Structures are given as C-alpha cells and as structure tokens.
C-alpha cells in the first residue's frame, strides 16, 4: 500500500510465484488503502518473496453510497475486479492467484469471484475477507466458490457481519489478523 499495480505493469515474461489482488474499504485512499491491504501484502511477502501486488482501482472509488446497492457494491466495481482476475489469467495462467478484501472491498471481491468462469476461477487458490458486509446474506462464504479456499474474518462486535451497515470499533481492527493468520492461510493455499 497505498498504491500497488504489480499486475497491471508486470510483464508476462517475468511472471512471479504468486499474485495478490486486493479490494480496499470504503473511503480508504489509493487502491490498497492503509490498514488491512498493506498489512496483508506485507505478511504474504514475508512468506513468498517474488509476488505481484494489485489494488482494485479504476472505477472503484470506495464511495459510501455504493454500499447500499444490492450485493454491497456497484456492478462497475465488480466488473473491474473481474477484469483483473482475467488479466492475471492472460498474463500468467500458471501462476497461482490469491485475493483479499476489506469491508466494501470484501463485498466486491466476493461478488467478482462468484461470477468467474472455469479456468480463471480455478487459478484463484484462496480468498481472505475482513469485516465482510455480505456475511449474513451469503451465509459466511462466497457463492460458487469452495468453502475450503475461503477464510472470513468477522470480529465479534462487528455489526456489518450480522447484516447491518454500521461501523463499530470492532470493524476497525483487522490488521493483526491480516498480517498474521490470513497471510499464513493464503500461503498454505498456494501449496
């Protein structure tokens, strides 16, 4: 963080050991944000040195209003996520992909992954979600995506996890989980 474009600017002659695609929370700066994104990128880089890191930018301006759409974000945003997954498959079809999302970015990634197709979906070895706004609606998981490849961090007092769009202090508190337990999970999923 706070801006990472490793996948967009990376060249197909120099594919890495892994690719991380991350969607930030509402109102966070850049395309990685400054809390969970960098923490996750950091933790994962400690286990896998040769890695491309990609924030979800483009139309995804992390607006407050878009939270109130069905599925927890706009289709434009979801589509930008899908684009990046497809670009990873085009550039580096043999490189494993992992993904992460925080708050509205979790909604984004969950939706995008669910709509992915066959080979491109298979490339996505693992997904970590934090303060998942559709946790109740999607019953703790991502539609059409193996539960064993999914890991959801939803703190106990975090009201978004129980179908309410309000922000408690628990929602602001995922950086340790992201750097530690979540990075280990995704590393494992890459082997």
- What ranges do the domains of the chain cover? 1-191
Please name the residue that has the structure tokens 């539960």. Answer: 147
Active site residue 47: no
Q: How many residues does the chain have?
A: 191
First to last CA, the chain: 25
Active site residue 103: yes
Architecture of domain 1-191 in this structure? 3-Layer(aba) Sandwich (3.40)
- Exposure string over 110-134, b if 16+ CB within 10 A, otherwise e: bbbbbebeeebbebbbbbbbbbbbb
Exactly one of 103, 114, 117, 188 is catalytic; name it. 103
Residue 127 forms beta bridges with which residues? 99, 150
Exactly one of 74, 114, 158, 188 is catalytic; name it. 158
**Helix (H) or strand (E) run with residue 38 in it:** helix 36-45
Q: Tell which residue, 130, 113, 142, has the closest CA to residue 170.
A: 130
Which residues contact residue 81 at a Cβ distance below 8 angstroms, ignoring those fewer than 6 apart? 21, 23, 56, 60, 108, 109, 111, 112
Active site residue 17: no
Exactly one of 46, 171, 173, 188 is catalytic; name it. 171
Alpha carbon 110 to its chain's center:
8
């Amino acid at each position: 963080g706070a801006i990472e474009n490793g996948l967009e600017s990376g060249s197909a002659n120099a594919c890495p050991d892994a690719i991380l695609i991350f969607a930030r929370g509402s109102t966070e700066p850049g395309n990685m944000g400054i809390t969970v994104g960098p923490a996750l990128a950091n933790g994962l880089e400690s286990h896998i040195r040769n890695i491309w890191i990609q924030g979800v930018g483009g139309p995804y301006d992390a607006a407050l209003a878009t939270n109130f759409l069905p599925r927890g974000t706009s289709q434009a945003n979801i589509d930008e996520g899908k684009r990046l997954f497809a670009l990873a498959n085009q550039k580096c079809p043999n490189t494993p992909v992992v993904a992460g999302g925080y708050s509205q970015g979790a909604a984004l990634i969950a939706a995008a992954v669910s709509e992915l197709s066959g080979a491109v979906k298979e490339q996505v070895k693992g997904v970590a979600l934090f303060g998942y706004t559709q946790n109740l609606q999607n019953r703790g998981g991502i539609p059409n995506y193996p539960r064993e490849r999914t890991k959801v961090f939803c703190n106990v007092g975090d009201a978004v996890c129980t179908g309410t769009l309000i922000i408690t202090p628990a929602h602001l508190s995922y950086t340790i989980e992201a750097r530690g337990e979540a990075a280990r999970f995704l590393r494992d999923r890459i082997r």
